[PDB]
């Protein structure tokens, strides 16, 4: 009978949409999950949606997910109060079943769920204070104290005095009464929190505005006899701007930095001003470029910019990354512009950084010497780099650092004779060449 077929296969599809939507609910997916859920026929499946949300909450695989499930139920209760009403009936009845069973786990689950539904104004604080009064007439205090941790902020706002009275009763037991040691300590801790104020207990998924929740605050009491329409969980047979071409904005900041730089005697007070500005991580790349561009105007290198960059490095690793990235940017992209003079500035300026290890040294690996790929201007750059880097180390420490720095592409031992001829011939063209002996051996080994 193809209407009974259609309506059954539609009911089945609705159930198997709702189940995986509930199973894929999280904070930061909740609003896409709620869209999808709203595109299912929630009203026809009202009991199917209630039973999946309860059974997921209650599966105790969750419990952590109770705040998420409560936020989903809050959204849905603004849309369709009849659904949130149904879900709150069954959850009350599940709490009272688990209390009477003495199932402490399902007490803890369902009580935490009622707590967060009250946090989201789905249900009235009356139900919480009645649950807590019932609990506190027996011990059950592990239950009562978890509940009060998870509602107790909202209870203090809405109903200070009743809550206060309960605390007085709760307080009364601890000071003048005998209790099991494990139970008491948890009981005391809640007492500690009251002085603390619950400041690890007011954080979550408030993803409806206090007027966009159409605030159907359902006034249940946990001693009604209620309905819970399990039967709606059967199958049945329903016969029913401007583009920016100008950096002038960045030009302002450029003049502010350059002006900070031209003031400030010594170097060590200029680092103070620059670090004082607290530059956002985005810009701390370019500020370096301003520094060096300025250093190229000075017509001669100065220890100033060296000690400046050194005092700037050691403060924060973002400046490490800054100078490294700018080293690659300079050597790779930007060298082709500079005349042989400004190269005399750059060579020493990076020499002081490398020889004292601030750079660090292995970042020299970018350099590769080939007739095919090199810049003669860049060649001069290397010349000044090592000719500065020697004078501080003295060609002694140089060989040790290099030999321990595993520079490969620059110092080929693997083969390619002609390249080794270019390397050795090059360092002998610098006027040093004493780094090339190990390669000279490989010449005779190749021949």
């Amino acid at each position: 009978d193809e209407d009974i077929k259609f309506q059954r296969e539609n009911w089945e599809m609705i159930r198997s949409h709702v189940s995986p939507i509930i199973s894929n609910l999280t904070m930061d997916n909740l609003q896409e999950s709620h869209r999808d859920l709203f595109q299912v026929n929630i009203l026809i499946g009202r009991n199917i949606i209630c039973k999946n949300v309860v059974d997921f909450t209650l599966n105790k695989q969750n419990g952590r997910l109770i705040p998420a499930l409560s936020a989903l139920i809050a959204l849905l209760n603004s849309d369709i109060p009849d659904i949130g009403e149904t879900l709150a009936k069954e959850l009350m009845l599940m709490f009272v079943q688990q209390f009477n069973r003495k199932d402490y786990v399902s007490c803890g689950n369902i009580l935490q769920c009622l707590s967060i539904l009250f946090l989201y104004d789905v249900i009235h604080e009356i139900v919480i204070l009645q649950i807590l009064l019932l609990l506190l007439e027996k011990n059950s205090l592990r239950l009562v104290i978890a509940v009060m941790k998870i509602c107790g902020w909202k209870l203090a706002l809405v109903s200070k005095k009743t809550h206060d009275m309960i605390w007085e009763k709760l307080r009364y037991i601890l000071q003048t009464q005998e209790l099991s040691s494990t139970l008491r300590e948890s009981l005391e801790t809640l007492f500690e929190i009251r002085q603390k104020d619950y400041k690890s207990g007011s954080q979550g998924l408030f993803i409806l505005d206090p007027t966009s929740y159409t605030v159907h605050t359902h006034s249940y009491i946990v001693s009604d006899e209620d309905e819970a329409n399990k039967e709606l969980g059967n199958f049945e047979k329903c016969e029913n701007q401007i583009y920016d071409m100008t950096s002038t904005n960045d030009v302002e900041f450029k003049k502010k930095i350059y002006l900070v730089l031209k003031s400030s005697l010594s170097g060590d007070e200029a680092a103070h001003k620059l670090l004082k500005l607290k530059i956002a991580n985005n810009l701390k790349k370019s500020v370096v470029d301003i520094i060096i561009k300025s250093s190229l105007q000075e017509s001669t290198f100065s220890k100033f910019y060296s000690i400046l960059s050194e005092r700037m490095i050691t403060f924060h690793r973002s400046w490490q990354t800054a100078y490294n990235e700018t080293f690659e940017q300079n050597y790779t992209q930007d060298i082709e512009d500079y005349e042989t003079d400004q190269l005399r500035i750059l060579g020493k300026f990076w020499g002081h950084l490398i020889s004292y290890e601030f750079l660090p040294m292995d970042c020299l690996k970018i350099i590769k010497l080939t007739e095919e790929e090199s810049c003669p201007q860049g060649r001069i750059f290397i010349k000044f780099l090592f000719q500065e880097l020697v004078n501080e180390l003295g060609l002694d420490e140089l060989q040790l650092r290099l030999n321990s720095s595993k520079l490969d592409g620059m110092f080929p031992l693997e083969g390619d004779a002609e390249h080794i001829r270019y390397s050795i011939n090059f360092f002998t063209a610098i006027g040093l060449g004493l780094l090339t002996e190990d390669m000279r051996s490989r010449l005779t080994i190749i021949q």
Binding site: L259, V260, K262, S263, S264, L265, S266, D268, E269, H272, E298, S299, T300, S302, K303
Partner: protein, 48 residues
């Protein structure tokens, strides 16, 4: 104006002994709004 800068203030009692370095800066010269001004020693290359 060569006097704005900032002046290293470090540790009167110790700087008689170690040369502690520059641990602090006393304000060199003042203003209503700060702005900044360049100072000569920056515009003349060092002897070295």
């Amino acid at each position: 104006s060569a006097s704005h800068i900032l002046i290293p203030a470090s540790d009167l009692s110790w700087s008689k002994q170690t040369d502690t370095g520059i641990t602090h800066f006393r304000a060199g010269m003042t203003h209503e709004d700060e702005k900044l001004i360049p100072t000569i020693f920056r515009y003349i290359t060092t002897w070295e």
